């Protein structure tokens, strides 16, 4: 009944997403408001915790089904598409593989964009496109990276830096005060409201892709609701900073998708920028490996003796990332687009549909691995909740959210143009 092996991967992904999306929350607040912003944050955090629970339950089910026949996974890490293939069929393996690949690609693109933006805000002698030139090389010389373990130790430092950045933002905006005449408009247009809602949905989207089977022996008595504990700490990180920055700076955030552009300049802001950039650069070396792994699986040059051949096979994975990070440098709305188009299907809809399909027949409900938990004492309860999750994330998270986000993105293009030199620079 290994559960703690999945919590590590999920916590790593969540702690990465939070720090990736922290700086663009006041923008979405100014688009939404305070009431709607806070309420949607709480709503989506709870939904994300619920889906992560289902992912853990499916992992345990698959493992217990496969160990019954006599197949061992020693010295191997289970993949999510392997789980879907072992539980449902082939089409689900295909769907999982495709969506995971696209999601990792665009996560890498977004991280490169963020690095360029922050390095601009520490030194502004070179425009953001030249900083993208410079950092593309430093992130394309990463093809020589082997498989790195120990994600938990790095995650517990990433959180230790994100907490400093968040509380700096909050306390600095509180001490700065608010200027005279600052206006708070609230929700006025629909496209703005829904692109903000989708940027909020993107925050709590993180899931386990590869889980090590080494820690199946552990069984602790203090790990009851670790998912809810992680979500509560993420709330403590993300609500005060965004609320304080929005309250202090008003409507001037619709033209600044990076909150470092409005804060005053002193030593503490320099420390915050430096800590954010270092964290952002390292997590690229941790997010690269799965995509390289899958690609080398496709090309078949995996068991290679010359490391240089691995670099030659991996260059066509870094070239489109660099080209996309140069051509579309939109730091704010790209989160909304990626969210609406990929996270709604990867984190929210496919886990629920898998849990609703694998347990349809009573022969699989009587011989299940894990019974329904105490807070959901019946199967009908879980089916109703999964149906609501699917319908909601299909209508709002993809219907209105996708349309609004794509229209906002196209307006950004028609305003700034292809290959923008400096996006939102005075």
UniProtKB/Swiss-Prot annotation:
Pfam families the record matches: Aa_trans (PF01490)
UniProt keyword annotations, A-Z: Amino-acid transport, Auxin signaling pathway, Cell membrane, Membrane, Symport, Transmembrane, Transmembrane helix, Transport
Extracellular topological domain: 36-37, 115-130, 176-190, 246-272, 336
Any one Gene Ontology molecular-function term assigned to this protein's record: symporter activity
Protein's membrane topology: Multi-pass membrane protein
Activity control, per UniProt: Auxin uptake mediated by AUX1 is inhibited by chromosaponin-1 (CSI), 1-naphthoxyacetic acid (1-NOA) and 3-chloro-4-hydroxyphenylacetic acid (CHPAA).
Highest rank taxon of the organism: Eukaryota
Phenotype for residue 205 to E: In aux1-106; resistance to 2,4-D, agravitropism
Tissue expression pattern: Expressed in root and shoot apical tissues. In root apex, confined to stele initials, protophloem poles, statolith-containing S2 columella cells, lateral root cap cells (LRC), and in epidermal cells from the distal elongation zone (DEZ) up to central elongation zone (CEZ).
GO terms classed as biological process: auxin polar transport; auxin-activated signaling pathway; establishment of planar polarity; lateral root formation; positive gravitropism; response to nematode; root cap development; root hair cell differentiation
Cellular compartments per GO CC: cell surface; endosome; Golgi apparatus; plasma membrane
Compartments (UniProt record): Cell membrane
Transmembrane domains' residue ranges: 18-35, 38-58, 94-114, 131-151, 155-175, 191-211, 225-245, 273-293, 315-335, 337-357, 384-404
Chief localisation class: membrane
Annotated phenotype, changing residue 217 to I: In aux1-114; partial agravitropism
Effect ascribed to mutating residue 250 to E: In aux1-117; agravitropism
Segments on the Cytoplasmic side according to the record's topology features: 59-93, 152-154, 212-224, 294-314, 358-383
Protein family (similarity comment): Belongs to the amino acid/polyamine transporter 2 family. Amino acid/auxin permease (AAAP) (TC 2.A.18.1) subfamily.
Function, in words: Carrier protein involved in proton-driven auxin influx. Mediates the formation of auxin gradient from developing leaves (site of auxin biosynthesis) to tips by contributing to the loading of auxin in vascular tissues and facilitating acropetal (base to tip) auxin transport within inner tissues of the root apex, and basipetal (tip to base) auxin transport within outer tissues of the root apex. Unloads auxin from the mature phloem to deliver the hormone to the root meristem via the protophloem cell files.
Entry protein name: Auxin transporter protein 1
């Amino acid at each position: 009944w290994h559960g703690g092996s999945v919590w590590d991967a999920w916590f790593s992904c969540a702690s990465n997403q939070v720090a990736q999306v922290l700086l663009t929350l006041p923008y979405s607040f100014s688009q939404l408001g305070m009431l709607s912003g806070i309420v949607l944050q709480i709503f989506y955090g709870l939904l994300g915790s619920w889906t992560a629970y289902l992912i853990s339950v499916l992992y345990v089910e698959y493992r217990a089904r496969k160990e019954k026949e006599g197949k061992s996974f020693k010295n191997h890490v289970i993949q999510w598409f392997e789980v879907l293939d072992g539980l449902l069929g082939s089409y689900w393996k295909a769907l999982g593989l495709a969506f995971n690949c696209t999601f990792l690609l665009f996560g890498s693109v977004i991280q490169l964009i963020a690095c360029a933006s922050n390095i601009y805000y520490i030194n502004d002698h070179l425009d953001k496109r030249t900083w993208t030139y410079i950092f593309g090389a430093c992130c394309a010389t990463t093809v020589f990276i082997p498989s790195f373990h120990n994600y938990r130790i790095w995650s517990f430092l990433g959180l230790g830096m994100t907490t400093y950045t968040a509380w700096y933002l909050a306390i600095a905006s509180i001490i700065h005060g608010q200027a005279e005449g600052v206006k708070h408009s609230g929700p006025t247009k629909l496209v703005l409201y829904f692109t903000g809602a989708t940027n909020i949905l993107y925050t709590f989207g993180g899931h386990a892709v590869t889980v090590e089977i080494m820690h199946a022996m552990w069984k602790p008595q203090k790990f009851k609701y670790i998912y809810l504990m992680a979500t509560l700490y993420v709330f403590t990180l993300t609500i005060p900073s965004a609320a304080a920055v929005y309250w202090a700076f008003g409507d001037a955030l619709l033209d600044h998708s990076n909150a470092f552009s409005l804060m005053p300049k002193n030593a503490w802001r320099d420390a915050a920028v430096i800590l954010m950039l270092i964290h952002q650069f390292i997590t690229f070396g941790f997010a690269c490996t799965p995509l390289y792994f899958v690609w080398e699986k496709v090309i078949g040059m995996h068991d290679t003796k010359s490391i240089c051949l691995r670099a030659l096979a991996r260059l066509p994975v870094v070239i489109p990332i660099w080209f996309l990070a140069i051509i579309f440098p939109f730091f704010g709305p790209i989160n909304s687009a990626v969210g609406a188009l990929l996270v709604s299907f990867t984190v929210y809809i496919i886990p629920s549909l898998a849990h609703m399909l694998t347990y349809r027949s009573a022969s699989a409900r009587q011989n299940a691995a894990e019974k329904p938990p105490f807070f959901m004492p019946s199967w009908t309860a879980m089916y109703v909740l999964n149906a609501f999750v699917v319908v909601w994330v299909l209508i709002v998270g993809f219907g209105f959210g996708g349309w609004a986000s794509v229209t906002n993105f196209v307006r950004q293009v028609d305003t700034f143009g292809l290959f923008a030199k400096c996006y939102q620079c005075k």
